[PDB]
Amino acid sequence: LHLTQDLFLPFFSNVTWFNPVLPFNDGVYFASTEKSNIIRGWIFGTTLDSKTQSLLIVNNATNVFIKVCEFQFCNDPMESESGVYSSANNCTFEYVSNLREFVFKNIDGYFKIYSKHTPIIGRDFPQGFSALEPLVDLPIGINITRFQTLLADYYVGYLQPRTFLLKYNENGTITDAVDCALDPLSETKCTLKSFTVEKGIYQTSNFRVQPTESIVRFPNVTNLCPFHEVFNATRFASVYAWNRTRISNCVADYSVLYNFAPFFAFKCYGVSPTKLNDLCFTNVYADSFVIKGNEVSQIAPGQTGNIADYNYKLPDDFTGCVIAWNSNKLDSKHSGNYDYWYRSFRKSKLKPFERDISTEIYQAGNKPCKGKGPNCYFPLQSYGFRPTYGVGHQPYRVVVLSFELLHAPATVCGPKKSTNLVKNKCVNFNFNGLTGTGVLTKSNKKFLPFQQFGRDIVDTTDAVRDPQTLEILDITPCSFGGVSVITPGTNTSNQVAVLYQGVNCTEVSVAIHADQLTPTWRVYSTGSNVFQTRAGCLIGAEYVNNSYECDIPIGAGVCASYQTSQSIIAYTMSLGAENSVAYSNNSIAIPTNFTISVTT
Amino acid sequence: EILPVSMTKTSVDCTMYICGDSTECSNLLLQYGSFCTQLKRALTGIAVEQDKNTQEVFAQVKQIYKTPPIKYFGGFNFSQILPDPSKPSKRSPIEDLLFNKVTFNGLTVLPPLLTDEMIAQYTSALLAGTITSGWTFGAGPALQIPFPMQMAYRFNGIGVTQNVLYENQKLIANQFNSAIGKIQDSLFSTPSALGKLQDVVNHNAQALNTLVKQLSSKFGAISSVLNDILSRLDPPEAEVQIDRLITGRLQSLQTYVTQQLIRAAEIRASANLAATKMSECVLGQSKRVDFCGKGYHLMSFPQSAPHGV
Amino acid sequence: QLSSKFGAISSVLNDILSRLDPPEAEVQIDRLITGRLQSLQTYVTQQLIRAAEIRASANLAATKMSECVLGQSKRVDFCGKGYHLMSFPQSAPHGVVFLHVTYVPAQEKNFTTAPAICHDGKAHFPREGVFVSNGTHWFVTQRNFYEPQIITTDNTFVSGNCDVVIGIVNNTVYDP
Ligand SMILES: *[C@@H]1O[C@H](CO)[C@@H](O[C@@H]2O[C@H](CO)[C@@H](O[C@@H]3O[C@H](CO)[C@@H](O)[C@H](O)[C@@H]3O)[C@H](O)[C@H]2NC(C)=O)[C@H](O)[C@H]1NC(C)=O
Ligand SMILES: *[C@@H]1O[C@H](CO)[C@@H](O[C@@H]2O[C@H](CO)[C@@H](O)[C@H](O)[C@H]2NC(C)=O)[C@H](O)[C@H]1NC(C)=O
Ligand SMILES: *[C@@H]1O[C@H](CO)[C@@H](O)[C@H](O)[C@H]1NC(C)=O
Ligand SMILES: *[C@@H]1O[C@H](CO)[C@@H](O)[C@H](O)[C@H]1NC(C)=O
Ligand SMILES: *[C@@H]1O[C@H](CO)[C@@H](O)[C@H](O)[C@H]1NC(C)=O
Ligand SMILES: *[C@@H]1O[C@H](CO)[C@@H](O)[C@H](O)[C@H]1NC(C)=O
Ligand SMILES: *[C@@H]1O[C@H](CO)[C@@H](O)[C@H](O)[C@H]1NC(C)=O
Ligand SMILES: *[C@@H]1O[C@H](CO)[C@@H](O)[C@H](O)[C@H]1NC(C)=O
Ligand SMILES: *[C@@H]1O[C@H](CO)[C@@H](O)[C@H](O)[C@H]1NC(C)=O
Ligand SMILES: *[C@@H]1O[C@H](CO)[C@@H](O)[C@H](O)[C@H]1NC(C)=O
16 A cells, blocks of 8 residues: 655646636546547647747657647648648657547656546446556656647546555555545544554544744835945945945835846845845945955955955955946056055954055064064055956945844834734734744733843744834744544544634634634534534534433543444543442441352 | 652643644654654553552442541540641541642643542541551451550560550550651641652653643754744755754653653652552551651551542 | 655656766765665664564563463463462463453442451451351351351450440350
8 A cells, every 4th residue: 555645637627618818737547438530639839829849749640640849730720531631840859650648747747648548338437446557658848838729528636745545465566545635534544554444543644734824024215225326336435445325214215226236246145135125124324345356256255365454354254246237338447557456465354344444564574563664565555457457457336235134123114014913813914024924912011111032931932013013913833733533443434523723713713713723624514513612623523411421532531433324423431330338337248159250 | 757649740742842733743653663653652542551550559348438437545635646627628637737838832731530529528437437447457357445445456466565555555645646747847847757758749840841842942953933933945955944843842751751650660669668558557557667767666647638548 | 765756856766876076976876875775774764663562562461471371370460360279381472371260259238247256245257257147047258159057166366345436236146
């Protein structure tokens, strides 16, 4: 008995029984039942307008001619003669050779076709079982999203990723596959890896109410950030005289800057999304650099060199993006731009986020240095930025953005529209970049007028207030728990009872009503069969005031059993019979006979 | 004499604990074999072991025995141990003192199968059978016998002739009454009498607290929260961080499960000892030295306690 | 668990070796080794715990055989439900089966009892029986099987006079 997860057709799903362009949702199921031979083939592709390589399939009488060509139309837009079709141009790949069932699957550039031609007796829809064998696997490797039937009484279904339990026969033939998400019983069957279940309690997957909406709440401050002005500054200072530029209280919409300049050195070390707009971070600390060509490699965490030891050093734990672009026509001079200087000598080493300001002559000799003369060199060299230099020596313009991402008790967020707050509802929240799920209620917490978040003994966020409303609210999570299944055995019957452990019956009923529970299968939930007990909510049976011996233990003194009008019943466990001994001042019972009993 | 009998039944959801409802984390966890299945099986085994422990300890009686309305037993008091109808749950005053003296992220505590009222009912039935039918009800059908005659038989059981009891019945009854009275004061004034049960509760609480607290450890990753890492990098880079967090949390779960298994084995041994004591010390007179008390044993009375007897 | 990738390229060493460079192959092999070693450690720990449990069970079985089979035990509900008589072991695969033979009384009968008997102005107590009456006549009998006997001096012993025992009852003790 093999349990496998793959794309399958869900049991008892809606099937459209019939030329529209049906979308190819990563797997389709085709079943045609005719004797007029009207169905002849199929076409596949994305646009199918003679631009991409459209897949062509045709079955004339016995063999399926498979071609990958570029055609506007086929024979399909009193059946006496037809062999002209419409187009078969630009064929880049070639192949040759009742109840016709077909499954078409495409994955990793492989076209898989599963066929099964079972001549069922009659023409009624068969309420039976029949597996499909792999006909051919074509590695043509093309994109397919839409398909149409070809003509000269069929069903179409879409495949979904499910988990199935398959029973292989001694001669390895699949018989009587069972689903794993249809019925509560056909979940315990998958769990136990068997087709027969015994009478008793059985644990299974967990239930969890899903979020309903998603709300994003950011404080209004719509000033755009002066990123472009920093980027489009006319002149940058020396590499050792790098300009720190703090940016705050604005909108960090720098995604537009991707197009203004043709970035060639765009590396992000700590955080690298292409869509870096949902990130809220405190400090940005923009920096301005002017370096040569073969120097951008030195701008990296854990990198050493002349620049790292004398001019500028990056910390090892750097979280930011490094951006550089060519500056030949704006940072060069014909006679040499003798204005950009860099530190070259120093009797010490630099540390991250430090700047050098002293310009005294470096002491390169044992004797004390006073002016030039002996071996004393000025620790400043002017760059000879000429336009005739090579790529490795051409000056470059570099900007360093150092982020500090630790929650968000501060400003500087990307562009994102706000959304109205919702109270008393299991809704995704994005309060100022703090993301999670839960139910938000009114909080009586006395927050001092500087505290933003709030933790608990386990250090989990339990309270938050948004600046746009300045109202404190707690973050109690959405309900969840484990569910159990009650069955009286496969031999006896098939009725089952489910127990949602540790949840209120009203809450689970509300979640069932507005289609909010993850275990999409639903018990019928009739009247007077929803019982509430300390163990949980038991919607599978009715409660009876009679007392019996325990059969299937549930908990808190409640046991379930199958009685006969056959149905499952829940009752309070009985502790045996009752017998009061007739104690008296003068009365003794003496046995008059015995029994020899043997026990194992 | 106090003996632990049971432990809190806990069930842990492996997927929710390791992965905070993230599909990408679940896909990576899926390649780590059947670890979560093993953990769930071990926890279920522990829970059913606890249920069997309490079932074996307290359900040794066949039929529920009811004491007669009039409660004269030749001067013996038997008030602090018999249930008092003038209160809910029908618990004896000593049981009342015992109960009044003692006292999130995928973790669930399952309630015990037998409620405390059922345990109290078993205790009352056992005590009534002991005081009415003597020790005969444990070896077959219950046979009525006056209490002074049962006490005379028990005196004969330790090499003392029965005339002593009929000679000093009043003195012996007064001595027993005073001794049973002093127990209430001993358990009231002294606050640490029930040390072992509270120790078990504290151990379980500490284990749970450590398990929940270790969810905040980075384990050498960017952050301790999955969702932030997911919405911070492309999946290929975030995979390493997800894997590190998964390994750390899985190790934490394995350690917790192993510790719970060892504690469950210890409590199983204690429950077997308690069941043996109830079978021998209560349902009869034991000649084993220093087993049913300190001295020549006469009789015993059980009293229900939270996760113990 | 040998077929689990454990977050690697594959689950077969040969493909990993003959698919990549030595460094990445070494990393993949290290991951696989860690996973498989953890699997072995878990299996060994489980085996140790089960071995301890079975050791306790075997000690209990040895005690039962030493006390219930090789002699008669007076412990209550240790060698069976009821008064123990004997036991017989039977070999079983990876275990043992005990056949406990017990004595169980039945067919109760009600009687009126008295703590003592006062014949010659002196209290009398049964030597090992229980004083019972069938309404008119008084007898002494065993406390586990009804067998009335005529009360006599050789059947009782005298201790004190007739003013201390609460439930003392007039009767006649016939001397032989
Ligand atoms: C280097 O970093 C400093 C510190 O962040 C920058 O400081 C100030 O930046 C503004 C905007 O570029 C400059 O312009 C002035 O802004 C004020 C804003 O209220 C405005 O009122 C003025 O009319 C003017 O537009 C400002 O001069 C500048 N101050 C100083 C002392 O430099 C600076 O711009 C950065 N420059 C670079 C990249 O070299
Ligand atoms: C048995 O013991 C109880 C417990 O002390 C006795 O109840 C006491 O009775 C006296 C006399 O009325 C009261 O002053 C006390 O307050 C009672 N104690 C409690 C705790 O209520 C009882 O008298 C004893 N004898 C019998 C036959 O029950
Ligand atoms: C399996 O193969 C054997 C040998 O060919 C055949 O006798 C048998 O009928 C086949 N099918 C089943 C269901 O046993
Ligand atoms: C801007 O924010 C302030 C403070 O939160 C608030 O009072 C004001 O209504 C907001 N304005 C708009 C247009 O949202
Ligand atoms: C379920 O909710 C209702 C009202 O919301 C409440 O009266 C009831 O006590 C709740 N159930 C439990 C077990 O507390
Ligand atoms: C037993 O004797 C006592 C003596 O105080 C008496 O109160 C009680 O009613 C008697 N029991 C009976 C007659 O059942
Ligand atoms: C005791 O009971 C048995 C039934 O098991 C019966 O055959 C026998 O006659 C009884 N003894 C007497 C003395 O009647
Ligand atoms: C006590 O004896 C009477 C008659 O002697 C009888 O009716 C009654 O059932 C007996 N009590 C028992 C057997 O508990
Ligand atoms: C009691 O036992 C005596 C013993 O001889 C017998 O004669 C008598 O009939 C029995 N029954 C009664 C009611 O005395
Ligand atoms: C027992 O005999 C004594 C002495 O004759 C007498 O005083 C007493 O009343 C008798 N008791 C009964 C219950 O007949």
